[PDB]
Design a protein around this nucleic acid. Structure first.
Ligand SMILES: [K+]
Ligand SMILES: [Mg+2]
Ligand SMILES: [Mg+2]
Ligand SMILES: [Mg+2]
Ligand SMILES: [Mg+2]
Ligand SMILES: [Mg+2]
Ligand SMILES: [Mg+2]
Ligand SMILES: [Mg+2]
Ligand SMILES: [Mg+2]
Ligand SMILES: [Mg+2]
Ligand SMILES: [Mg+2]
Ligand SMILES: [Mg+2]
Ligand SMILES: [Mg+2]
Ligand SMILES: [Mg+2]
Ligand SMILES: [Mg+2]
Ligand SMILES: [Mg+2]
Ligand SMILES: [Mg+2]
Ligand SMILES: [Mg+2]
Ligand SMILES: [Mg+2]
Ligand SMILES: [Mg+2]
Ligand SMILES: [Mg+2]
Ligand SMILES: [Mg+2]
Lengths: 58, 251, 159, 211, 105
RNA sequence: GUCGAAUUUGGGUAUAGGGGCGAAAGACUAAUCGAACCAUCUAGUAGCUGGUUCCUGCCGAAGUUUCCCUCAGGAUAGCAGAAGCUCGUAUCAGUUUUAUGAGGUAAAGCGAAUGAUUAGAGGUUCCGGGGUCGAAAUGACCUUGACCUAUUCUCAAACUUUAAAUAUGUAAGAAGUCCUUGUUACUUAAUUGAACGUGGACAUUUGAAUGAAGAGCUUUUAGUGGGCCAUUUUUGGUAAGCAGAACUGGCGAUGCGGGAUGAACCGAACGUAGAGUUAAGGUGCCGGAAUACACGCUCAUCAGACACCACAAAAGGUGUUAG
RNA sequence: GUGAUUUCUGCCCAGUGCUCUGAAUGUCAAAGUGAAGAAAUUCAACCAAGCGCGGGUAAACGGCGGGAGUAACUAUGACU
RNA sequence: GAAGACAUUGUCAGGUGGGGAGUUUGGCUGGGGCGGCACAUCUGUUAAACGAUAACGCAGAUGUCCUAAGGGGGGCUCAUGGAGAACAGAAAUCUCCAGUAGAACAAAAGGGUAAAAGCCCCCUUGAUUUUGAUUUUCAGUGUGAAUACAAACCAUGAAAGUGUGGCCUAUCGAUCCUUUAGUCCCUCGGAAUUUGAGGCUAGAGGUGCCAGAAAAGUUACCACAGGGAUAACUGGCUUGUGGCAGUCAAGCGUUCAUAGCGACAUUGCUUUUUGAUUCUUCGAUGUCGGCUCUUCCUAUCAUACCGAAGCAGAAUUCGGUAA
RNA sequence: GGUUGCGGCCAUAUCUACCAGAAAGCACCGUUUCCCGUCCGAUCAACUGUAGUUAAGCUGGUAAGAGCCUGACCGAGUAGUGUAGUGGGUGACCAUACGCGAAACUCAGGUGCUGCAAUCU
């Protein structure tokens, strides 16, 4: 015997039962895959601004 | 009705560069066994012959058995099955395989095979490629035959083909003695064509090419010193009893 | 057998347009990209390094990273029954700013001008866009413009 | 060799011309396309008649061959062999395949069979240009050629002068001045653009205003 | 292919950690050796009655080995390995490409 | 057939299962033989066939993805149920608009490149070759092709300057815009930028339309992994109730009215009843409903009579009807 | 193995077998021998039959071709 | 009497050993076999202008080659055509004008490139070290291939810069086992030293049936579980081929297209041929021919009555109503 | 406005053929000791603004020029195409309804614009 090889029939119908949903944006994206030279400075930037506000609101 | 030809001979050969097919195409013409065919088609590693009658295609295979090493088999396809007798109407296909070791290849033989056929060394050239395959040992002249029945039951392949030859330049030939039929065992002093101009290096090797070798002649050969093979038969050798340079032919 | 290489079916898609071969013009390199900028992806065929896959031809996305001679674009690709967030690394030759977002920022400045001017003038704003409305009544004159009578023409061959 | 023409009637497959992929194809049955006095000037044969198709079909090469002979044989014997100019406006480029014969369908791509044309609704097949008095011979000539083809086609008397793209009175307006000169078979016209120096090299009867 | 005998490359041998001269050679096998735990385990299992216990490979398709090059820093004699693509031929020394020579003989 | 023996036959005795016996048939060895019979191991294994026991209620599929000595089977993703949990006008949407990108199919084109292709007219010969006048000529006088000039007939799934429709990406704001002056080891010639901030200003016309039996999130587990039909686009084939794809709708899992009859066509999707109204299809009788009305056309010694559908063509006719 | 009688039983020992009052330094296990080492171990020489080499054998298995020539106008193919 | 430390007997080691035992003897597939590889990959097209997309569809390629054909910098312009220069001619070398690429770029094809990515020179090892992120195929696993950075160390260039192999799209491989480089670091568990062995991090030895078994035939003496998922036979769909009938009319028929014939073409009917297909049947529809016996069809061989003829008669030839 | 250096968009800027160019600037142009490079001071290097020229380059103008570019009550609402019907037609294909809508061809007009710095009867 020989089979049926391939089809895309019904596959869109199945897909639209549950959404085709978007992946949800957030405030602050992940710094995964961002320039290392940028991050290595950005760490020390946020350390100083907290110490400034801590010294201000001491 | 589609099935017109009614017998096929599917000849084939496993080698990328076929000397034996080009030889066979020349040999078939001389004696001229072709004529009864309706047509000829081709394929990757050989070519197809189509015959009206079954007895026309059997003469061809008997002719092929005469002049070249082969293996073959027939199978059949049914079509009609007429209930009035004398015509079931079958269609036949003969699948012929030429032996892949060509005329001038460099071959490592299997150990048991080598011990049986005259106690010949494992590291050999081919000689003649007729009805059966015959080998020669370029250093210690010697010969040994191998029939298709003995080949096919335990098949092996060539170490290096005609496309691996390299150009050398002969400087002197010192003869030692023996001559069974070819004025043989010549200690050929040779140097590489890419080396003759620039660099100093000389290779000195015993060779079967004694009767036809002259100083200053360009000779072709296998240069085993720089080749990384991957044969297990070759892996079972003596990384030091093996000759540095082997020369296949003059020119 | 089948064939699904990296640049399969891209005969015309990385072709160079008619009479636009050779070196690229310099404004391509002087355009500045910050993080958060919207950018369109069109593949220049003459540059081989830092080239996008054929799928991303036409697609649009946001910048997340800036480097030496490249930027980090983030695109949403749909696969199966969901979208996946995919991260690219393209050289500046295969990229440009989206003019849709440029048009938008102009409209925000305009709204700030309207609302500030409305308070000084005296109430009533109305700042949303309205779609094309159904048109009003009018009186079209026939003075020096009397209707010309047409009729369906007869059939002729001329071949 | 030949199958019936009913098999290769309709335009089913895509255009399959002779090229570096097809290569080995048979020769066309029709060979010469122009007949009659084909070294004749434009002023000699004003009256034009067409044979227009009315179906989306395929005319084979050998269908045109017999149709071309039949129309020629009648028009030569009746009115003389130099009283017309017949032109065939359809060349067969489409190659037809045939499944002439491991098994039936286990590997089945057809060999080249023969050539054919691809005619559309409103496309001209034959064209004849003749004298004014010799109309009836031309119409009756293309009648017998109509039987050799498949499908339905109709003969039409043209309003144009000869094979030119100009009406009966329109050609007279331009030729009465110096605005037209004879090329050989067809004709060349004046154009208001171009270099004015070599517009006077040719058309010396124009640029005068007299006769 | 045809690599040269010498090579100036990155050594990482404490005192070095920089580009230095390396002597290049071709990597070679290393002998089988019994008393390796696998060979000891194999010979135990193979004894007695039963015959061949382990599989024995036959169907081989590859025709060329990958080349490995032993490098060796001349300052500190600290070795390093470096692998090349597959090739039917391999040597190392002179034999340079010339200007534009035609064929001879 | 043979019938005085290589004859026929009783009783006793010997040969036992991978063994015996065999004038050789794989014959015979207790109706069992290309490996007897009995008991046990043994409920041997089976991706294969057959069966699988009460009622109602709610929800409700799949024949597709990748990998496997895989193709009558599995794992994996998908579709389905169940349990919920965090919140509560939500941000979303098999949709349109506005703005803005991306594409090389249909068409068109070849007096535009590439390749194919019919005809003449004008030229060019120190130059592919013949003839005419020749001692030869980088000579003339005739000629058939090669290119050159402006023309002309016709084409292209694996040609193209141009280039649709349909389908397709992004945006249409509070996680926003503007002002003010803090952090840093990054960056700049430079407290210049860069990124993230402090403090202040801007509210329900808060920044197109329509909708929203909520929005978001998690765990777990069933069946399924032979499909088929229809319009349009389609490749193989002379074609097929044939083989293989593309988008949507169906049957499979589905009754009901219609097509006489029919898985898929048209209509329309089902709790139990009453009344009204229609769909598709019909209204001479079978058969519920006008042997209604109106203008025409046909007479057939094979009339014709309702989509899918159950066939008819080229070619002809002082048959009759209009042009 | 062949299968009464009668009359015959051609050529072939390369291949596969079988064989041998033949050749000898080509291959070759265990134990034994020597050297290296603290020892476990390692490396070498030595070496039975068999294998290989050489002879015999077809009422052993079996096989009995292909290409060229010249003589009688041809042909046959006695002959090369 | 013979024979005698040899035989014999016991343990180990080599040879021989279908006499015997156990096992195996790929997949896809218009039935199976043969062939092929559509089994791992790459270009164009099929492919219906996002992406995705099938057939034993079409046109072809891959298991390599390269210390430069890799990296940086400098100089320069190609294919071809025209016009010239002793030997020198269609082709040698030199000069000038034209020249948008019509050349070259290791190899299939498609893209790309002109003070270069092409040709010729100078200098070189970035075809290096440390490990993470991302794209493609995709389960968003592995394998291969590729992209952008970082931390060192270098190459080249006056410099900006460029460079982590080949201008881009193909050129390749797990666990177990062996072996190499590194730390020369950890362990041998009563405590030590030296050999030996075992670990940790990174490569190589290979599985082309390419996510990776160690594998010959035969059954006409055969067996079991199944299969109409699948052949051999009726039936059904189709009608290329076979059979039968038209149209047109260049020619044949002494004379004359059509008494009778008829080429090049073109439109059909039939299921008495044979293919193509695989819908029904493998818990069985008895598979050739002849004998026997009934009925139906007409495309009429004879018989009835007629019409044409190159029909004088005779004998024939073509057609009509007729089974 | 003319010219120079550095540009942006990359033919409205290109191509072919003739014509004009005061001032300054470009340019050709002169020399070979030095650094430097060649078969050759031709190119490239250095030196002099000296001996001389607008003859070339360069900038502008002309041509019922070739090309290129923008348009149009040009062709054409044509070709094609999404949606619909128990519409037509034996078929091949074709009309209608609700929408979207090209290209060639024809005619008209055009033939570089502009940023930074310096300098000019
Ligand atoms: K049982
Ligand atoms: Mg399936
Ligand atoms: Mg038997
Ligand atoms: Mg019995
Ligand atoms: Mg049970
Ligand atoms: Mg429900
Ligand atoms: Mg726009
Ligand atoms: Mg196209
Ligand atoms: Mg395409
Ligand atoms: Mg339904
Ligand atoms: Mg019903
Ligand atoms: Mg019905
Ligand atoms: Mg009728
Ligand atoms: Mg007998
Ligand atoms: Mg199978
Ligand atoms: Mg596509
Ligand atoms: Mg390169
Ligand atoms: Mg029998
Ligand atoms: Mg079936
Ligand atoms: Mg089927
Ligand atoms: Mg029965
Ligand atoms: Mg009848």
């Amino acid at each position: 015997a020989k089979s049926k090889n391939h089809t895309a029939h019904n596959q869109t119908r199945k897909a639209h039962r549950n959404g085709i949903k978007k992946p949800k944006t957030y405030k602050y994206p992940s710094l995964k895959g961002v320039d290392p030279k940028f991050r290595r400075n950005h760490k020390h930037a946020l350390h100083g601004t907290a110490k400034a506000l801590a010294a201000a609101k001491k | 009705t589609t099935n017109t030809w009614r017998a096929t001979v599917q000849i084939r050969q496993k080698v990328p560069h076929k000397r034996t097919f080009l030889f066979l195409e020349q040999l078939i013409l001389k004696h001229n066994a072709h004529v009864d065919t309706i047509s000829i088609s081709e394929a990757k590693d050989g070519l197809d012959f189509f015959y009206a009658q079954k007895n026309h295609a059997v003469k061809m295979i008997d002719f092929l058995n005469a002049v070249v090493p082969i293996k073959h088999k027939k199978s059949e396809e049914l079509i009609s099955q007429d209930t009035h007798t004398g015509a079931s109407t079958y269609k036949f296909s003969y699948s012929v395989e030429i032996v892949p070791i060509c005329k001038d290849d460099l071959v490592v033989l299997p150990k048991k095979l080598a011990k049986s056929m005259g106690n010949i060394s494992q590291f050999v050239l081919c000689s003649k490629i007729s009805n059966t395959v015959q080998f020669m040992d370029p250093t210690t002249l010697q010969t040994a035959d191998l029939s298709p029945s003995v080949y096919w039951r335990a098949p092996f392949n060539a170490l290096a083909d005609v496309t691996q030859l390299v150009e050398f330049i002969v400087l002197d030939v010192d003869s030692t003695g023996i001559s069974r039929g070819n004025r043989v065992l010549a200690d050929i002093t040779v140097a590489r064509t890419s080396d003759l101009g620039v660099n100093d290096q000389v290779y000195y090797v015993r060779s079967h090419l004694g009767g036809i070798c002259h100083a200053g002649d360009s000779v072709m050969g296998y240069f085993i010193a720089n080749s990384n093979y991957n044969s297990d038969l070759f892996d079972g050798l003596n990384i030091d009893y093996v000759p540095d340079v082997v020369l296949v032919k003059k020119l | 057998g089948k064939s699904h290489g990296y640049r399969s079916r891209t005969r015309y898609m990385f072709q160079r347009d008619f009479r636009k071969h050779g070196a690229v013009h310099l404004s391509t390199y002087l355009k500045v990209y910050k993080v958060g900028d919207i950018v369109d992806i069109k593949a220049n065929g003459s540059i081989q390094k830092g080239m996008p896959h054929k799928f991303y031809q036409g697609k649009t996305g946001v910048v997340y990273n800036v480097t030496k001679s490249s930027v980090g674009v983030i695109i949403n690709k749909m696969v199966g029954n969901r979208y996946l967030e995919k991260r690219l690394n393209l050289r500046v030759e295969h990229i440009k700013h989206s003019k849709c977002r440029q048009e938008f920022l102009e409209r925000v400045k305009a709204n700030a001008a309207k609302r500030a001017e409305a308070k000084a003038q005296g109430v009533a704003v109305q700042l949303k866009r309205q779609p094309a409305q159904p048109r009003e009544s009018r009186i079209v004159s026939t003075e020096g413009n009397v209707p010309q009578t047409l009729a369906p023409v007869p059939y002729e061959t001329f071949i | 060799a030949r199958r019936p023409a009913r098999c290769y009637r309709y335009q089913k497959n895509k255009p399959y011309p002779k090229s570096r992929y097809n290569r080995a194809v048979p020769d066309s049955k029709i060979r010469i396309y122009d007949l009659g006095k084909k070294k004749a000037t434009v002023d000699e044969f004003p009256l034009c008649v067409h044979l227009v198709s009315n179906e989306l079909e395929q005319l084979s090469s050998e269908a045109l061959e017999a149709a071309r002979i039949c129309a020629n044989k009648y028009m030569t014997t009746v009115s003389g062999r130099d009283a017309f100019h017949l032109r065939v406006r359809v060349h067969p480029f489409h190659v037809l395949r045939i499944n002439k014969m491991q098994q039936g369908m286990r590997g089945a791509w057809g060999k080249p069979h023969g050539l054919a044309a691809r005619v559309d609704i409103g496309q001209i097949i034959f064209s004849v240009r003749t004298k004014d008095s010799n109309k009836d011979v031309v119409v009756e000539g293309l009648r017998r050629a109509r039987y050799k083809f498949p499908g339905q086609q109709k003969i039409i008397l043209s309003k144009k002068w000869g094979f030119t793209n100009l009406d009966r009175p329109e050609y007279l307006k331009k030729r009465e001045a110096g605005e037209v000169k004879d090329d050989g078979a067809f004709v060349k016209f004046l154009s208001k653009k171009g270099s004015l120096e070599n517009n006077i090299r040719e058309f010396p009867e124009y640029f005068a205003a007299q006769a | 292919v045809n690599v040269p005998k010498t090579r100036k490359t990155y050594c990482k041998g404490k005192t070095c950690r920089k580009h230095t001269q390396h002597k290049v050679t071709q990597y070679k096998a290393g002998k089988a050796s019994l008393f390796a735990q696998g060979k000891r385990r194999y010979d135990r299992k193979q004894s007695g009655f039963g015959g061949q216990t382990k599989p024995v490979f036959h169907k081989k398709a590859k025709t060329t080995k990958k080349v490995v090059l032993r490098l060796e820093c001349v300052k500190c004699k600290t070795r390093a390995q470096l692998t090349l693509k597959r090739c039917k031929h391999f040597e190392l020394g002179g034999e340079k490409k010339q200007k534009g020579q035609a064929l001879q003989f």
